[PDB]
C-alpha cells in the first residue's frame, strides 16, 4: 500500500547502507592489518573503529528483521542482546573517534613532541575505550525487563518509574554531546593551526568528519530524549524513528572511507 512505500524505501536504504558499510569496514580492517602497519601509526586506533562500526552494522539486519518494521520481534534474548550491543558499540566507536581526533590535534599542534614521544600508550588506550563503553552499557544491558503486555512483542525496558529517561539524558551528555563538542573544538583548532602555519582538501575532510560523524547522523537522540513529552501518531512515529535510525549507520559507513580509503597511504598501496 502507499503507506508502506516509505517503510519499504527506508528498509532498502538501510540494507544498502549496511552492505556498503560492512564491505568497507572489512576491507579497511584487512588492509590496515595486512599492509598499513609501519606507516599510519594511528592504525591501531583505526582497527578499533574498523571493529566497532562492523558490529554496529550487524544491528541493521535485525532492525529490518522486525517483520518489515511491524508485527513480530525476536523476544527477550533478541532485545536484551541487541540493546547492549548497540550501546556498547556506539560508545566504543565515538570514543575511538574522540581519541583519534585528539591524537591528530596533538600531532598538528605539537609536531616535534609527538615524534619525540613513545607510542606504547596507544594499545592501552584502545582497550580503555571499550572498558569505558562497558561502564556506560552495563546498566542498560541488564535493565531490559522483557515484553510485558499491550504489544505482544515490544520489550518495555524501563527498570524504574521512567528513570531510564535520566540515564538516557546522561548518556546523551557523556557520549554524543560531550565527545561531539570535544571533536569540534579539537578539529577547529587543528584547522586553524594548519591554515596559519601552512598553505602560505584536508580541512574539508576535517570539517566533514566533525559535522557528519558527530552531529547529523547522531540526531536519533533528539527524538528519544523527548521521552519527557512529545505529541506523535503511530504512523508518523514509526516513519520518523526509522528515518532517524538509518543516519547512525550511514555515519558508520562513512567512517572507514574518510579515515582509511581516501588517505594517501591507501592510494600508494593501491
Amino acid at each position: 500500500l502507499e503507506d508502506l512505500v516509505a517503510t519499504g524505501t527506508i528498509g532498502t536504504l538501510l540494507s544498502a547502507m549496511g552492505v556498503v558499510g560492512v564491505v568497507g569496514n572489512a576491507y579497511t580492517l584487512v588492509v590496515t592489518c595486512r599492509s598499513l602497519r609501519a606507516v599510519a601509526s594511528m592504525y591501531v586506533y583505526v582497527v578499533n573503529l574498523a571493529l566497532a562500526d562492523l558490529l554496529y552494522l550487524l544491528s541493521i539486519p535485525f532492525i529490518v528483521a522486525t517483520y518489515v518494521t511491524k508485527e513480530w520481534h525476536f523476544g527477550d534474548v533478541g532485545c536484551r542482546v541487541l540493546f547492549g550491543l548497540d550501546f556498547l558499540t556506539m560508545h566504543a566507536s565515538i570514543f575511538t573517534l574522540t581519541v583519534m581526533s585528539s591524537e591528530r590535534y596533538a600531532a598538528v599542534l605539537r609536531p616535534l613532541d609527538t615524534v619525540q614521544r613513545p607510542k606504547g600508550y596507544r594499545k592501552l588506550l584502545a582497550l580503555g575505550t571499550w572498558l569505558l563503553a562497558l561502564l556506560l552499557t552495563l546498566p542498560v544491558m541488564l535493565a531490559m525487563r522483557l515484553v510485558r503486555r499491550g504489544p505482544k512483542s515490544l520489550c518495555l525496558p524501563a527498570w524504574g518509574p521512567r528513570a531510564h529517561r535520566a540515564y538516557l539524558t546522561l548518556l546523551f551528555a557523556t557520549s554524543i554531546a560531550g565527545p561531539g563538542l570535544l571533536i569540534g573544538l579539537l578539529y577547529a583548532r587543528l584547522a586553524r593551526a594548519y591554515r596559519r602555519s601552512q598553505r602560505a582538501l584536508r580541512l574539508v575532510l576535517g570539517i566533514v568528519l566533525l559535522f557528519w560523524a558527530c552531529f547529523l547522523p547522531f540526531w536519533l537522540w533528539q527524538l528519544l530524549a523527548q521521552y519527557h513529552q512529545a505529541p506523535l501518531a503511530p504512523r508518523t512515529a514509526r516513519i520518523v524513528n526509522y528515518l532517524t535510525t538509518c543516519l547512525t549507520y550511514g555515519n558508520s559507513c562513512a567512517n572507514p572511507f574518510l579515515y582509511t580509503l581516501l588517505t594517501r597511504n591507501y592510494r600508494d598501496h593501491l
Partner: peptide, 8 residues
C-alpha cells in the same frame, strides 16, 4: 509505544 530503534 515506541522503544529505541526497534518499533512495534
Amino acid at each position: 509505544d515506541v522503544f529505541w530503534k526497534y518499533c512495534v
